[PDB]
A paper describes a structure:
Bacterial homologous lysine and arginine decarboxylases play major roles in the acid stress response, physiology, antibiotic resistance and virulence. Inducible AAT-fold basic amino acid decarboxylases (LAOdcs) have been studied since the early 1940s1,2 because of the link between their enterobacterial pathogenicity in humans and their ability to overcome the aggressive pH environments and oxygen limitation in our gastrointestinal tract. These enzymes decarboxylate either Lysine (LdcI, also called CadA), Arginine (Adc or [name]) or Ornithine (OdcI or SpeF) into corresponding polyamines while consuming protons and producing CO2, thereby buffering the bacterial cytosol and the extracellular medium to promote bacterial survival under acid stress conditions. Here we show that the Adc from a multidrug-resistant human pathogen [name] massively polymerises into filaments whose cryo-EM structure reveals pronounced differences between Adc and LdcI assembly mechanisms. Like all proteobacterial LAOdcs, the [name] Adc monomer is organized in three different structural parts.
Moreover, as we observed [name] Adc by cryo-EM with the goal to solve the structure of the decamer presented above, we discovered that most of the Adc double rings were linearly stacked to create double-rings and longer filaments. Consequently, we solved the structure of the [name] Adc stacks at pH 6.5 that was used for protein purification to a resolution of 2.15 Å. The atomic model of the decamer stack reveals that upon polymerisation the conformation of the Adc decamer remains extremely similar, with minor changes localised to interfaces between monomers and dimers, and at the interface between decamers. The inter-decamer interface is mainly stabilised by a salt bridge between D472 and R492, both located in the AAT domain and respectively situated in a loop following helix α18 and in a β-hairpin. Remarkably, D472 and R492 are replaced by G472 and T492 respectively in the solved structures of E. coli and Salmonella Typhimurium Adcs, providing an explanation for the inability of these enzymes to polymerise. We note that the isoelectric point of the decamer shifts to 6 upon stacking, in line with the burial of acidic residues at the stack interface. Specifically, although the diameters of the LdcI and Adc decamers are very similar, the height of the Adc decameric ring is 105 Å compared to the 90 Å height of the LdcI decamer. This height difference, resulting in a 95 Å repeat distance between successive [name] Adc stacked decamers compared to 76 Å in the LdcI stacks, is caused by an inserted β-hairpin in Adc, which contains the stack-forming residue R492, as well as by an approximately 10° rotation in the wing domain.
Author numbering:
A (entry chain O), B (entry chain T): 1 to 755
C (entry chain G): 1 to 190
Write the structure that this text describes.
């Protein structure tokens, strides 16, 4: 219990109020309430902005100064940003407080403390009662019940066998493990047979309470907590929605769990192809692919679904936002898909915070909006561990019931089919605390902090880029708008000169406009997509605005090697693009390290420092090649290779044309089960049907799904695979990743259906 | 670091050795090694038997006394039971040790310490070096690498978003949650992109090391760590094995994950029916159901598989051991099924320790045996959290490659299909520590401790039962052999009089013999099944040996209510049977509480204590019925109801006859997906096809699977459901559980396929 | 919480049982259970006959002496004369206790503590659980509910006017009166 006391000047002579406050602080310490005494509102504001738990605020001001009134109101608002229901006591002389009494005072003051005419013991008792009341409502239901049950230490005669961690403390290695992970983790692993807490699979007790709380917080009709991640969540949604006699509309930018759901359901997929830009960044699906006529055309043209052209599709999935932070206008997507489907699934695995900041308005699934009765059913999956605060494997399913809704009894079958009978309650507790953390003022405050950090990094990088350009030097630039317009006053700013409040408040500063060249998605409609500020992509020089390489540049693979050497691991990477994640776990000013690392890379690149000094791990791959070679020598070698081979055109060819479909993904997988598959080298792939999905990095989305033909000799897909293989052969230590292939003696092998 | 010093009398005058040992202890304390000095080998043995970590043992004896030599050898053997590689220093006068030097001495002594002619500093340095060497090899690979990486605190720019728990410490509730679960749990949640540790799904790095270690420890060719429990493990095995064009042989005593695998694969199942006894305990499948002719007959008689009589079945699953501790002779089962199948899956979810105690020899899958080349492929699934020491959702897949084996590339597809892309590494670490805990001497020692505790409980209960019977009173009796025979000397003992060593050593003391009446499995072959000692069933009086009820008895539901009131929750329960689990997390002498609780129940039952005083929660269900009623009044009411209705015959009728099969489980589930299902009351179930499985408790195994007909008016299955419903109506607060039903206003509803 | 340990001679050599009991007492003190260690049943009887609250009894005897068995039974009966449901733990070597196991033993023993082969931490945890179970049933209903409610200190807006004794602490004579009679008397006047 900690009480914060902030008073400036209550009496004309300081000693009276100081002695009264000292007596109160002594009485509070005698009841085990720690006290922090602060004499200035700016100091109190600084104290509050440190993530220190405050159980009660007692403040007093001059009471005749409007400036101190404004400062006190600011202090209380700041306190309630992240500590929402902390009691506030007004310390004041009685007459001064009574003449200032009004509705606005009572909006922020919970109790009165007549510090100059009341015993410190009475005030201390009231403060303690208020603190206890505040603490009793602080925790979310599941976490509260788990903590309450954790004090039980009796041997139950049932599983789990470790019995609250006792089993581990019987060998020395078990004792080390038990001491490392701590007792409370094992004492919450209690099984699903303790009625005090409830059961997750039955959605009873504290688990039912937590799911209702999460549905309220995230704006869903029903919510389901999942302990198998968004992979499991996607599987259960797809299992509840489609059947092998169904046609489904699949975002080609789909996670592999979507293809797993296709395999497990046997549905026949039709694909909407997303757009691409000159950097190899996958962009949004254009509205021309979601229109009812486009979907009917796709169904009529598909070899497997052409006998189902009269059948309404049972399910559609759109990934929003994308891996590179492109956010759809979900309202417009829903309106477009409403003309063809009754079920829309938004895979928002990376997009869980979007509801809690106004910058994302209309660009997510569970919007605060008036809902009509003819809406489609909407599903949203959040990976709570990705960009929210939860342990790995924690996930949510959010449902908004509309047309052709699935009731609880039917949905529970799929839910159980992809779950476990013994969930780990720590994962569910992390889900519950994440939902609580986004609840109320705190979600807005946390999203604001992350967005502001990302904006500071973007503006600093843009400023440095302009400085180096003015000195006719190269540098990295952030991937966002070059110029932003203030919609109120009409004034234009360079991005690095724009006021931070404008960038934090105005959505149009992040919308992809068709007239702008920065995003590179040609023919995108206006007010369709938007850039997520906290997914920061930086661009290495070398790519022209027209789509062709420049005379010189710095490939991103070398910068990635540098960052890995310094511990920074980017989320995504193309030839010239590096993506950095700003999360709610970042601390303020941390991006200075990133800027410093990029500057030191530029220094060593301009100096052509030998790779042995700077990047010994790169040398250790091929010491005969990279030995006696400098940083800029390797960079120019890579850029010359890129200029000669132009793999970006290969990527565009491979992803603009869809492969020929021979069978459903389920049929292809059942070929694997029947042992009718073989490993085929890339040079022999012509005419072969892939047994599993091929996902090259870049662009990180599947080029081929299971049951799709590789194509003839001139197929762009085999060509792209060959290009990646050639790059791997030419540059050891900078090898591309390609899911769905086996690399034997540096050569690519693909599992294919035997003819 | 703790060193144990055990010396008795090294010199004719005690002061010399005492002063030398004091100097050594001082020098050891100066290097931060804690020392425990013990003057007697029995005291040292007692110290070792307390689960205290000992890093080094320094001992000395008389060196001319053979009794002290035997005692010292016993002490070292006891120490290495659970602390296997702890260094042992011999403290001795040089000449005495040298004259006693031989191979047998060096088998247990690692180093010499000439305590009377060497500086204490030199010996202390050598002891410290030995302790460091021992500590450096103590942890298993994955746990060691995770602990080593946990010291890193830098902000990675990738998921998970909480970034080692930093994200939680930004709201007060998050801070409470973070402090409760501790920092190390969040700092190990690092994602699959840290190459220092490796990746679970790629089986690389420390994860590959841990899986190889587990395969060695559990005697498998390959092992897979699973974070979705045995449900997930069963799903991936079944997905890798069968296809919708396949016929499979399914143990009717199957977990619901087996039916989920059937739904997800579309295979056509044929069932082997297990046996039952008079207590409603499900027993083993008899050999007459596994013969090739029996399987061919089942295939030819099945409505769905009768067009596949020439097709070899692709998969079989047997649950071993069963829920009530019946263990198959797995060697004989494998020999029987080898004549019909190439893949046998042993679902050993409750049976993970069996390899590590000789009492279970030949009664588990991965046996230490000479393996021929014509064996079938064997799968075994262990739920490491059930009866081993692991967190919930931890599981293993063990494979022994034989006929029609599945190579790694093909199996990995199913493995990924039922996994998540973001596993929680704490679960894998718990799997690794569980495997390490069963490794070497420690697995034998831990299984021995659990078995001895269960035997002590069984013998004490049998003795009390005999005492009460001699006083012509009733009591509970353990479900095991009444008389055991010593195979060496031929001597017979009553079970409560048998030597504990005989029961712990001789397997035949637990084998179900056809001539014995205790197990009640009529016509069981000899040396076919065996009782697991640590799954202790107790029998309430009331059931005759012939199969019919006696004139009086105590129903087990009331005893279960009593135990629940005292916190004990049994694993399984029938009309007269209560099952208690003894796990490796139990402490010695804990079963005294169970005995005390049963005795106090008997006292209150004989005294007819009013239910308000003893069981207020029972009264709170139906205060108008249970008010003003005693314990024995309720017991006799329940027994009269059982005598009148005889639900055991209903259970026997329902489970001896299989329901008519109308479609595969996948077809029935796809009816759910197509919304062609409805909730049907029990009285209207005639002719209806169940959409999901119906699992009544008792007997806790499915009575109907998905796609099976309920039957006509005289169907035993509808009759059994009606019996359970009638019991629930007559006795509020003692309601049976039935998975697959909905209970609306106390009435049973079953989801059925629309006709 | 106070635990009474009464053991006389469990092993042929005293040091083994003494060291085991010392370890158990240390583990009990680390969980805030005060321990009284007594080596003779007559001394334990004298201790019990002093009106001192005992929350748990842990005892061990020779286990082959019928006289010590009679003395231990007398000690437990004396303890339960005025402290009726105090848990009784038997400290013993496992084999000796198991050969002496019968109905008459279980009539007076609630739990077993294999002091020579069990960790002192496990036994201490079980002792603490037993003590908490015993303490939770000790008070009669009205007294228990009054004590539970007495922690509330909020100003109700109803009578009695003194409001848990706060009203008395406003004059010096009232403060003397309030300190004399104590706070809990006024906080139960609700």
């Amino acid at each position: 219990m900690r009480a914060l006391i902030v008073y400036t000047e209550l009496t004309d002579k300081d000693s009276v109020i100081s002695h009264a406050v000292a007596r109160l602080a002594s009485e509070l310490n005698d009841e085990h309430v720690e006290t922090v005494i602060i004499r200035d509102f700016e100091d109190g504001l600084a104290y509050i902005r440190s993530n220190t738990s405050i159980d009660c605020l007692l403040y007093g001001r001059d009471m005749s100064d409007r400036d101190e009134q404004i400062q006190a109101h600011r202090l209380i608002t700041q306190l309630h940003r992240r500590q929402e229901d902390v009691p506030v006591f007004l310390l004041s002389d009685r007459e001064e407080a009574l003449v200032a009494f009004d509705r606005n005072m009572m909006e922020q003051v919970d109790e009165f403390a007549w510090i100059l005419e009341d015993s410190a013991d009475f005030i201390a008792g009231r403060v303690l009662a208020a603190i206890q009341r505040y603490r009793s409502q602080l925790l979310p239901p599941l976490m509260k019940s788990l903590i309450k049950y954790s004090d039980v230490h009796e041997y139950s005669w049932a599983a789990p066998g470790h019995q609250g961690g006792v089993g581990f403390t019987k060998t020395p290695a078990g004792r080390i493990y038990h001491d490392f992970f701590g007792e409370n983790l094992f004492r919450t692993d209690i099984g699903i047979e303790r009625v005090a807490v409830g059961s997750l699979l039955d959605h009873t007790g504290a688990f039912g309470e937590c799911e209702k709380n999460a549905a309220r917080i995230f704006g869903a009709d029903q919510s389901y907590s999942v302990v198998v991640g968004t992979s499991g969540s996607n599987r259960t949604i797809m299992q509840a929605c489609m059947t092998d006699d169904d046609v489904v509309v699949i975002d080609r930018n789909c996670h592999k769990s979507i293809e797993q759901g296709l395999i497990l359901t046997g549905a026949k997929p039709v694909y909407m192809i997303p757009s691409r830009n000159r950097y190899g960044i996958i962009g949004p699906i254009y509205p021309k692919e979601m229109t009812p006529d486009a979907i009917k055309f796709k169904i009529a043209a598909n070899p497997l679904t052409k006998g189902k052209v009269k059948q309404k599709p049972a399910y559609s999935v759109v990934t929003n936002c994308t891996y590179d932070g492109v956010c759809y206008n979900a309202r417009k997507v829903q309106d477009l898909l409403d003309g063809s489907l009754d079920r829309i699934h938004f895979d928002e695995a990376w997009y869980g915070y979007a509801r809690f900041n106004p910058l994302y308005r209309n660009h997510f699934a569970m919007r605060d909006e008036e809902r009509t009765e003819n809406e489609p059913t909407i599903f949203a999956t959040h990976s709570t561990h990705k960009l929210l605060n939860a342990l790995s494997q924690a996930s949510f399913i959010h449902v908004r019931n509309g047309r052709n809704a699935i009731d609880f009894n039917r949905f529970n079958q799929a839910y159980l089919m992809h779950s476990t009978t013994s969930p780990l309650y720590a994962i569910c507790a992390s889900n519950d605390i994440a939902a609580d953390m986004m609840d109320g003022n705190s979600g807005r405050s946390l999203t604001d902090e992350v967005i502001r950090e990302s904006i500071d990094f973007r503006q600093s990088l843009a400023y440095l880029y302009k400085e180096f350009l003015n000195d006719d030097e190269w540098f990295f630039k952030p991937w966002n708008q070059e110029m932003v317009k203030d919609p109120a006053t009409g004034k234009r700013y360079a991005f690095e000169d724009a006021p931070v409040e404008l960038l934090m408040r105005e959505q149009s500063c992040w919308v992809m406009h068709p007239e702008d060249k920065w995003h590179g998605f040609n023919d995108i409609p206006d007010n369709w997509a938007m850039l997520d500020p906290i997914k920061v992509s930086i661009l290495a020089p070398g790519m022209g605005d027209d789509g062709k390489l420049l005379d010189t540049g710095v490939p991103a693979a070398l910068v990635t090697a540098w960052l890995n050497h310094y511990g920074i691991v980017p989320t995504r990477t193309t030839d010239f693009q590096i993506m950095f994640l700003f999360s709610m776990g970042i601390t303020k000013g941390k991006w200075g390290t990133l800027v410093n690392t990029l500057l030191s890379f530029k220094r060593h690149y301009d100096n052509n420092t030998a790779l042995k000094k700077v990047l010994p791990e790169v040398v250790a791959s091929a010491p005969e090649i990279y030995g006696e070679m400098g940083l800029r020598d390797l960079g120019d070698k890579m850029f010359a290779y890129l200029q000669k081979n132009n793999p970006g055109a290969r990527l565009n060819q491979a992803y603009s044309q869809l492969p020929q479909v021979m069978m459903t993904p389920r049929d292809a997988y059942q070929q694997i089960v029947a042992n009718r598959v073989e490993a085929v080298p890339v040079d022999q792939l012509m005419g072969r049907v892939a047994a599993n999905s091929i996902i090259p990095y870049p662009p990180g989305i599947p080029m081929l799904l299971s049951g799709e033909n590789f194509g003839d000799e001139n197929s762009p897909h085999i060509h792209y695979l060959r290009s990646l293989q050639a790059w791997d052969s030419e540059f050891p230590g900078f090898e591309h990743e390609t899911e769905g292939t086996e690399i034997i003696d540096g050569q690519y092998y693909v599992m294919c259906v035997k003819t």
